Design a protein around this ligand. Structure first.
Ligand SMILES: *[C@@H]1O[C@H](CO[C@@H]2O[C@@H](C)[C@@H](O)[C@@H](O)[C@@H]2O)[C@@H](O[C@@H]2O[C@H](CO)[C@@H](O[C@@H]3O[C@H](CO)[C@@H](O)[C@H](O)[C@@H]3O)[C@H](O)[C@H]2NC(C)=O)[C@H](O)[C@H]1NC(C)=O
Ligand SMILES: *[C@@H]1O[C@H](CO)[C@@H](O[C@@H]2O[C@H](CO)[C@@H](O)[C@H](O)[C@H]2NC(C)=O)[C@H](O)[C@H]1NC(C)=O
Ligand SMILES: *[C@@H]1O[C@H](CO[C@@H]2O[C@@H](C)[C@@H](O)[C@@H](O)[C@@H]2O)[C@@H](O)[C@H](O)[C@H]1NC(C)=O
Ligand code: CL
Ligand code: ZN
Length: 607
């Protein structure tokens, strides 16, 4: 480690800690910067040489983290939590958790290579037929969204899960062991315990479970209604009205968001078409327009535009020069207070317009907290960070807002139109809840050792069936590693943040709508051009992780905890309607034929 980046001496106390943090701050931006830059260079241009560079950057960050980490424990370990500066306790607390820097050098290098190899396998996996092969984004994504051929959907789903998952398994095993080894030396029972610790809530798992109990009935009713809609198309051979839904028929590779099957489930087809995808295509929207339209929503609230550096640096379309890139949409803080970028393989659809807003929310958080100490440039918790963009997208998706921006010609305010909208939103927001909840239940079990490698897939499918009421459309065994075919697993990104976000965003939406002086039904609120709403959101964004999330939440919404009531209020009309409709249709809620799997198509896969 360069002498300029090494820690000096400091008194064994608060006053020494404060100069220690400022000295860290000075060195850390360079170290954070070089790490992020090397990761950017790799993820926008996946090559062996860019991986080597990213690994060397990662070693340097570990060197840095070890030096500054061990210094913190030399001086403070027996006394550190009693500092009177709460921001400084947070800075120190982060600094003294070494993580992968606890590993001896040989194991660090092993750990870094595993992350690099897992990333490459996920983002370069292909399904081949012929010499021609399909990538996840856009080819397989488009098949899952637009094919209504059972066999074609099956080919794409099976191909992807087999291509990505199978080779990932042995690496994921080794990564899990090393990660646990690392975090155990910080005093955590396992890596999952460290990940949950970010919410600073001793009742976190019980609180999540209590939220899910309130939300599950909404999901079961949506599920049953959608299952009926699918049965009407695919027939009795491939849909069991008392069984789990085949996991490939819901519009999405992970069955995590169901908005692509909206045309099959829309209650009142004769009302205005609320999926504006076909209008975006007819009007010739491109990625550029989508990012500018999203930006202009943020500036309408008197939040910040995207700086020149964002526009010059960002990757907003998949490269047409054939390069391998990480297509999974992401938002980048380079930790130099100037460079902020999005990397998205943007496609021209309504849900991608929502995703643009999501990623731009991350960026806005970065812009607003850029002058805080680098350890406090985080969301109040990770769920806050995931919620910001989704909150704006809630306003954007309203038929009134879509009309304002030229995407929906007809205006209507009737009960049928409200049901259509709320159903469309339920396919996006309610359908996700079980998946948002289950992914880290799986991963927490892997980290704790409750789920060894011998049960990776068995336990994944247990949770997929238990929560989502889906089944794999072909047989799986423990050679398959279906968890690994979801980005966040091989890319080691925690998932419970998204469950938290999906509840939180309705709390935020309710609070901002009220601050805006809106007095109508919550699901028709649009905060566009509300400078008052913008000011309230800005307070949250400027806090970063400087204060406990419970206090930030309380200032924003009047409550110091996650609460499902705003979400339930938003959806109330369609919750009631789906319940009535399922009862009238004689549906079974749930999937009591839990063992059921669909048969193979007659000629699969030669067709
Ligand atoms: C779509 O239509 C709804 C329903 O409007 C109501 O019912 C219709 C059939 C007609 O009879 C309307 O005349 C009637 O308002 C609109 O929702 C309603 O919005 C109004 C105006 O913001 C709300 O009234 C306010 O209520 C608060 C107290 O909650 C008062 O302090 C205010 O002074 C004001 O009177 C009304 O509560 C609300 N009703 C419901 C059931 O939510 C909605 O605004 C409209 N949407 C659009 C986009 O036009
Ligand atoms: C993709 O990454 C490779 C490196 O792995 C880049 O190729 C290098 O380009 C730089 C100029 O920026 C030269 O100094 C090197 O001689 C090149 N190395 C090799 C091995 O060819 C390439 O420029 C990157 N592509 C893009 C579009 O940025
Ligand atoms: C796991 O499954 C692998 C391939 O899938 C199988 O092939 C299709 C045609 C059906 O037979 C389906 O039921 C199977 O899933 C096998 O190559 C492999 O032997 C199995 N793995 C182990 C460890 O036994
Ligand atoms: Cl998280
Ligand atoms: Zn995100």
């Amino acid at each position: 480690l360069d002498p300029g980046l090494q820690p000096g001496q400091f008194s064994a106390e608060d006053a020494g800690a404060q100069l220690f943090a400022q000295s860290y701050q000075s060195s850390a931006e360079q170290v954070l910067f070089q790490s992020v830059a090397a990761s950017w260079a790799h993820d926008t241009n996946i090559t062996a040489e860019n991986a080597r560079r990213q690994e060397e950057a990662a070693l340097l960050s570990q060197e840095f983290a070890e030096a500054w980490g061990q210094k913190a424990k030399e001086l403070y370990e027996p006394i550190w939590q009693q500092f009177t500066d709460p921001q400084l306790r947070r800075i120190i607390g982060a600094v003294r958790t070494l993580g992968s820097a606890n590993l001896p050098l040989a194991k660090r290098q092993q750990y870094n290579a595993l992350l690099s190899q897992m990333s490459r396998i996920y983002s370069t996996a292909k399904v081949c037929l012929t010499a021609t092969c399909w990538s996840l984004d856009p080819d397989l994504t488009n098949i899952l969204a637009s094919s209504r051929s059972y066999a074609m959907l099956l080919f794409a789903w099976e191909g992807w899960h087999n291509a990505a998952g199978i080779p990932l398994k042995p690496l994921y095993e080794d990564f899990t062991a090393l990660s646990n080894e690392a975090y155990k030396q910080d005093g955590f029972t396992d890596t999952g315990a460290y990940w949950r610790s970010w919410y600073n809530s001793p009742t976190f798992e019980d609180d999540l479970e209590h939220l899910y109990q309130q939300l599950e009935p909404l999901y079961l009713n949506l599920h049953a209604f959608v299952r009926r809609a699918l049965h009407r198309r695919y027939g009795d051979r491939y849909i069991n009205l008392r069984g789990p839904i085949p996991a490939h028929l819901l519009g999405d590779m992970w069955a995590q968001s169901w908005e692509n099957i909206y045309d099959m489930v829309v209650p009142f087809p004769d009302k205005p078409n609320l999926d504006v995808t076909s209008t975006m295509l007819q009007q010739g929207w491109q990625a550029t327009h989508m990012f500018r339209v999203a930006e202009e929503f943020f500036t309408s609230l008197e939040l910040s535009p995207m700086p020149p550096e964002f526009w010059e640096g960002s990757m907003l379309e998949k490269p047409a020069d054939g390069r391998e890139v990480v297509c999974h949409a992401s938002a980048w803080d380079f930790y130099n207070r100037k460079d902020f970028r999005i990397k998205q393989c943007t496609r021209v659809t309504m849900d991608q317009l929502s995703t643009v807003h999501h990623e731009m929310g991350h960026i806005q958080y970065y812009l607003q907290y850029k002058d805080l100490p680098v350890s406090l440039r985080r969301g109040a918790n990770p769920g806050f960070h995931e919620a910001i963009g989704d909150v704006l997208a809630l306003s954007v998706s309203t038929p009134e807002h879509l009309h304002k921006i030229g995407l929906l010609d007809r205006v209507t305010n009737d009960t049928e139109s409200d049901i259509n909208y709320l159903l469309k939103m339920a396919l996006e927001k309610i359908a996700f809840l079980p998946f948002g909840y289950l992914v880290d239940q799986w991963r927490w079990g892997v980290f704790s050792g409750r789920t060894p490698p011998s049960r990776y897939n068995f336990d994944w499918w247990y949770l997929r069936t238990k929560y989502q009421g889906i089944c794999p459309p072909v047989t799986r065994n423990e050679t398959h590693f279906d968890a690994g075919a979801k980005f966040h697993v091989p890319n080691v990104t925690p998932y419970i943040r998204y469950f938290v976000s999906f509840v939180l965003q309705f709390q935020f939406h309710e609070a901002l709508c009220k601050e805006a002086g809106y007095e109508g039904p919550l699901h028709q609120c649009d905060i566009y051009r509300s400078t008052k709403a913008g000011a309230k959101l800005r307070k949250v964004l400027r806090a970063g992780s400087s204060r406990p999330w419970q206090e930030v939440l309380k200032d924003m919404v009047g409550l110091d905890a996650l609460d499902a009531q705003p979400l339930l209020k938003y959806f109330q009309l369609v919750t009631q309607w789906l319940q009535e409709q399922n009862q009238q249709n004689g549906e079974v809620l749930g999937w009591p034929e839990y063992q059921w799997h669909p048969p193979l198509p007659d000629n699969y896969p030669e067709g």
